[PDB]
C-alpha cells in the first residue's frame with residue numbers, strides 16, 4: 005500500500021509493472037537465458053506460454069540475438085530502431101544492462117522519420133539565444149509547436165528543492181501555472197535521482213492498465229531494477245495527480261547544468277500520447293544541447309554581474325580619492341550600492357546614525373539589529389534569508405524586510421552597509437486563476453496544483469529570496485574595497 | 495625524542511616550553527588562580543618562589559588583574575601595550591583564553607612607536623597594485639626595507655601542498671631561493687593548522703635556551719595548549735634547519751585567501767631579532783590587507799582569463815558561419831586554441847588524421863593515445879598531469895608531454911582537440927647556486943634547502959603543472975562551442 009504518509013520513501017525504481025505501449029524481456033548478464041518477461045510479451049511478439057526458462061535464441065531467434073549482443077559493446081541504453089523478429093514483425097528495441105541484468109524493451113516500429121534532421125532544426129532555433137530568459141521563453145514555444153503537446157512547462161529547482169514554473173506554452177483553454185511554485189516534497193529524492201540517470205521520461209496513458217513483470221521477485225528474493233527502462237510504470241500517487249489535472253500523458257526532459265539537476269522541460273497532453281523512438285532520440289539530443297547552452301549562458305551572466313560590480317566599485321574608489329570626508333560620501337552614495345546586489349532596500353549604519361532607502365526595517369528597530377550584526381559578524385559578511393529565525397522581534401516587519409545581508413565598511417568601528425529583501429510571497433508574479441478548482445480521488449485534495457502552491461506558500465513564510473553565491477562574492481569584494489579605502493582615510 | 499621518522503606527527507602545539515624573550519602565566523577560565531607559569535617569571539617580573547597556587551591578585555596586583563578581566567570581553571588574542579605592574583615595571587601583555595584556560599604573556603615594553611601609522615604607510619604602497627605579480631614583487635622589497643630583515647620570501651602552496659618561492663628580497667651576499675620548490679613534508683599538517691590560526695609567528699633566537707612551563711603536565715594529565723601563544727617554542731627539527739641555513743631569527747605572516755592558507759610571507763635574519771608588540775600589530779594588519787588585495791586580484795585575473803576565452807570562441811564561431819568545410823577550418827586554426835589554456839603544445843585528432851603544434855607526443859604514439867582518450871572520455875573533458883600513470887608507454891616522451899587535456903569536438907565521431915604540457919622540471923626557472931653547500935647537525939643533510947629541492951624534484955618526475963579549475967571550465971566552454979557548431983554542419 006502507498007499513501008501520502010510513506011510516498012517520500014516509495015521504491016519507484018522496482019514497481020514490478022511496465023506501461024502497456026510496449027513489452028519487456030529480462031535476460032542474464034550475457035543474454036543466454038530469459039529470467040523475466042512482461043505478461044503482454046506473448047500478445048505483442050506472438051508467442052505461446054511462459055517464456056521464463058526458454059533460451060534467448062529460442063524466443064527471439066539466432067538472427068536477432070547476435071545483433072543485440074553486438075550492440076552491448078555503461079548504463080546508457082542502446083536505441084535500435086526498425087529491428088525484425090524471425091516472425092517478420094518490425095520493432096524498435098531499447099537495450100541496456102544494469103546490476104548484471106540485460107533488459108530488452110519492444111515498441112511497434114513507427115520508424116518513418118529521421119531523428120537527426122528534426123533535432124538539428126530545433127537546436128538551430130535555440131543556439132543563437134543571447135540570454136537565459138530568451139532561451140527558456142523560446143524553448144517552451146518551440147517544443148509545443150514541434151512535438152504537439154497541449155502544454156509545455158519549464159520548472160527551475162530553487163536552493164531548497166522547491167520547483168518554480170519559469171516558462172509556459174499552452175492551449176488557450178487551459179489554466180496557466182506561470183510563476184507558480186511547488187514544494188520539494190512534490191518530487192521525492194528517489195524521483196530526482198532517476199531524473200538525473202534518464203534524460204527522457206514518458207507516460208503514455210495515466211488511465212492505462214499497467215502490465216505486470218513475471219516473476220515480480222525471483223528465487224534470490226530480488227526485484228527487477230527498471231531504473232533505465234523507458235517502460236517502467238509510474239507511482240499511483242503521481243498517476244492520481246495527473247488525472248486530477250486532466251492530464252492523460254506526459255514527457256519530461258532533464259536539464260543537467262554543472263552535473264546537477266537544474267530543472268525539467270515537461271510536456272503535458274490531455275489525451276493519451278506516446279512518441280515513437282526516432283522522435284524520443286531527437287527530443288533527448290535537443291535536451292542535451294538546451295542543457296549545454298543554458299550552462300554557457302549562466303556562466304556568461306555570472307561573469308557580466310561580477311564585471312559590473314568591479315566597474316561600480318572602481319567608480320566609487322575614484323570619487324573617494326577626490327573627497328576629504330569619506331562619511332559624507334557614504335551618506336550621499338549608499339543608495340547607489342543597490343545596483344551591485346538585487347535587493348528591495350539598502351541602509352547605512354555609520355557613527356550610530358541610520359540612513360535608509362527602499363524597503364528597510366523601521367527606524368526604531370535598527371539599533372537592536374545593528375547590535376546583533378556587530379556580535380555575530382566577526383568582521384566578515386553575514387547574511388540570512390530568514391531574519392525572524394535569528395531575531396524573533398523581526399517577525400513584525402517581515403513583509404518589508406525578511407532577509408538581510410550585512411557588509412562591514414570599517415576595520416575599527418562597528419559601521420555596516422545593510423541590504424534588505426521583502427518576504428518571497430510579496431514579490432509573487434502569479435499568472436494563474438484563483439477561482440480554479442480540481443476533481444480529486446481516494447488520496448484527497450493534496451494532489452492538486454491549488455494545494456501544492458498553498459503548502460509552498462506556508463513553507464516560505466517570513467523568508468526572503470536566498471542570497472546567491474554571486475551575491476555573496478560581490479558583497480565580499482565590496483567589503484575589501486570599503487574597508488581598504490576607510491583605512492587610507494585615517 | 496623527535497627525529498626524521500615521527501616529525502610529521504610531532505605535537506608542536508604542546509611543546510611544554512616558551513622562547514626566552516618573554517615570560518608566560520597560565521590561569522583558570524575566570525583568572526582567579528595561577529595554574530602554571532614559566533621558570534623565568536620570577537627573573538623577569540621580580541617574584542620569589544613557585545607561583546602555582548598563589549591567587550591572581552597576589553602575583554600581579556588587584557590594579558592590573560581588573561584591567562585584564564575587562565579585556566577578555568573568541569580565541570583572537572588581545573594586545574595590551576605598555577601595562578604597569580604593582581612593582582612599577584612596564585610590560586606589553588598578550589592575553590587570550592583557549593580550552594577554558596587563560597594565558598598571559600609578558601614582554602619588556604619597547605612601546606615608543608605608533609602601530610596604525612606604520613601599517614597605513616605600508617598598505618598605501620600595495621593598495622594600487624593592478625596584478626598579482628606587481629603585488630608579490632613589491633611586497634618582499636617593502637617588508638625588507640620597513641622591518642629590516644636580511645631576507646624576505648613569499649612561498650605559494652601548490653595543489654599537492656608543496657611550496658614555491660615566488661618572490662625574494664635579500665642582502666646581496668646571501669644565496670637566492672627564487673623559483674625553488676620545497677616538498678609538502680617540509681611543513682607538516684599540524685604546522686599548516688597553526689599557521690591558519692595565527693596570522694603572525696616569531697622565532698627570536700634559534701640558538702636561544704628554551705624556558706620550561708611548570709608544570710609541563712597537571713594533575714589531570716593535561717598538557718598546556720600554546721596554539722595561540724606567541725612565545726610557544728619551535729620544533730627542534732625546524733630549529734636545526736634554520737641553523738644549517740645560517741638563520742638565527744624568523745617571522746612569518748599567514749596569507750589567507752578564500753578562507754584557505756594560500757602561502758606565507760617569511761622574514762629571515764642572520765642574527766637574533768624580536769620585533770616589539772607595536773611593530774607586530776602593524777605587520778599583522780599589513781598581512782590582513784595583503785591577503786584581501788591578493789584575493790580581489792586573483793578574482794579579477796580569473797574573470798579576465800574566462801572573458802578572453804569567450805571573445806576568442808566568438809571570433810571562431812563567426813569564421814565557422816562563413817566557411818563551408820568545418821574540418822578544413824579546424825586544421826588551419828587549431829594552433830590558435832593554445833591562447834585559451836596555458837600549454838607547451840596542442841594537437842588536432844580529426845578523421846583518424848593527426849596535426850600537431852609545439853611540444854606534442856611523437857606522430858607514432860598518437861593512435862594509442864587517441865584510442866585511450868575515446869575509451870575513458872565518455873564525451874566529457876578528460877585531463878591528467880601524470881600521463882605515464884594512465885599509459886606506461888607515455889613515460890618515454892614525458893620530457894616533451896607529461897600532461898594531457900582532451901576536448902571532444904564532435905557529438906558523433908571520436909574527434910579531439912588535445913592540449914599538452916612538458917614535465918614540471920623542464921619549465922624550471924631556478925635563480926639559486928648549484929655549488930652552494932650547507933653545514934649539518936645530528937639529524938643529517940635532509941634539513942638543507944639543497945636536499946629539500948632534490949626531494950621535491952623526484953616527487954614530480956614524469957608529471958606536468960596540474961590543470962587549474964580555470965583551465966577546466968574554459969575547456970568545458972570550448973567543448974560546448976565546438977560540439978555545438980559541429981552539429982549545425984551536418
Ligand SMILES: *C/C=C1/C(=C/C2=NC(=C\c3[nH]c(/C=C4\NC(=O)C(C=C)=C4C)c(C)c3CCC(=O)O)/C(CCC(=O)O)=C2C)NC(=O)C1C
Nearest residue numbers: 011012181186189190191195238239241242254270453456
Ligand atoms: C508524497 C509524494 C508525492 C509525489 C510524488 C511524486 N511526484 C512525482 C512527479 C512529479 N510531481 C510534480 C508536481 C507537479 N507537476 C505539475 O505540473 C504541478 C502543478 C501544475 C505539480 C505540483 C512534478 C512536476 C513531477 C514530475 C513530472 C511532471 O512534471 O509531470 C513523482 C515521479 C513520477 C514519475 O515516475 O514520473 C513522484 C513519485 N508528488 C506529490 O505531489 C506528492 C505529495
Ligand SMILES: *C/C=C1/C(=C/C2=NC(=C\c3[nH]c(/C=C4\NC(=O)C(C=C)=C4C)c(C)c3CCC(=O)O)/C(CCC(=O)O)=C2C)NC(=O)C1C
Nearest residue numbers: 501502671676679680681685728729731732744760943946
Ligand atoms: C619532518 C619534519 C620536517 C619539518 C617540520 C617543520 N617545518 C616547519 C617550518 C618550516 N619549514 C620550511 C621549509 C623551508 N624554509 C626555507 O626557507 C626553506 C628553504 C630555503 C625550506 C625548505 C618552512 C618554510 C617552514 C615555515 C617557516 C619558515 O619558512 O621559516 C615547522 C614549523 C616551525 C614553527 O613552529 O615555526 C615544522 C614542525 N621541516 C622539514 O624540513 C622536515 C623534514
Ligand SMILES: [Cl-]
Nearest residue numbers: 135136137138
Ligand atoms: Cl533579458
Ligand SMILES: [Cl-]
Nearest residue numbers: 625626627628
Ligand atoms: Cl604582470
